[PDB]
Each structure stands twice: as C-alpha cells, then as structure tokens.
mmCIF file of C-alpha atoms in Angstrom:
data_model
loop_
_atom_site.group_PDB
_atom_site.id
_atom_site.type_symbol
_atom_site.label_atom_id
_atom_site.label_comp_id
_atom_site.label_asym_id
_atom_site.label_seq_id
_atom_site.Cartn_x
_atom_site.Cartn_y
_atom_site.Cartn_z
ATOM 1 C CA UNK A 1 -14.511 -20.165 -3.293
ATOM 2 C CA UNK A 2 -14.474 -18.157 -6.568
ATOM 3 C CA UNK A 3 -10.733 -17.740 -7.306
ATOM 4 C CA UNK A 4 -7.527 -16.246 -5.782
ATOM 5 C CA UNK A 5 -5.395 -14.359 -8.399
ATOM 6 C CA UNK A 6 -7.863 -11.403 -8.315
ATOM 7 C CA UNK A 7 -7.338 -11.148 -4.533
ATOM 8 C CA UNK A 8 -3.555 -11.245 -5.196
ATOM 9 C CA UNK A 9 -3.788 -8.501 -7.891
ATOM 10 C CA UNK A 10 -4.172 -6.147 -4.873
ATOM 11 C CA UNK A 11 -0.433 -6.658 -4.137
ATOM 12 C CA UNK A 12 0.363 -6.351 -7.870
ATOM 13 C CA UNK A 13 -1.724 -3.163 -8.289
ATOM 14 C CA UNK A 14 -0.151 -1.426 -5.233
ATOM 15 C CA UNK A 15 3.119 -1.330 -7.254
ATOM 16 C CA UNK A 16 1.471 0.596 -10.123
ATOM 17 C CA UNK A 17 -0.361 2.772 -7.553
ATOM 18 C CA UNK A 18 2.979 3.646 -5.862
ATOM 19 C CA UNK A 19 4.486 5.076 -9.087
ATOM 20 C CA UNK A 20 1.092 6.500 -10.181
ATOM 21 C CA UNK A 21 0.760 8.298 -6.811
ATOM 22 C CA UNK A 22 4.365 9.612 -6.984
ATOM 23 C CA UNK A 23 3.651 11.245 -10.385
ATOM 24 C CA UNK A 24 0.605 13.122 -9.012
ATOM 25 C CA UNK A 25 2.450 13.719 -5.704
ATOM 26 C CA UNK A 26 5.387 15.344 -7.564
ATOM 27 C CA UNK A 27 3.277 17.376 -10.042
ATOM 28 C CA UNK A 28 -0.495 17.974 -10.412
#
C-alpha cells in the first residue's frame, strides 16, 4: 500500500549487518 523498496532494504541491510557483526564478533 505505501511502498516496497523500504521492505526490500531489509535484505540490503542484512549485508551491512553481516560485516558489522563480524567486526564486533572478532574484536570488542
């Protein structure tokens, strides 16, 4: 109803979250 790209950003953000999580997972 509103849009669709924002709902898709979830699959685009998980890529940045994967590397972002690995950095904190490796060193904190």
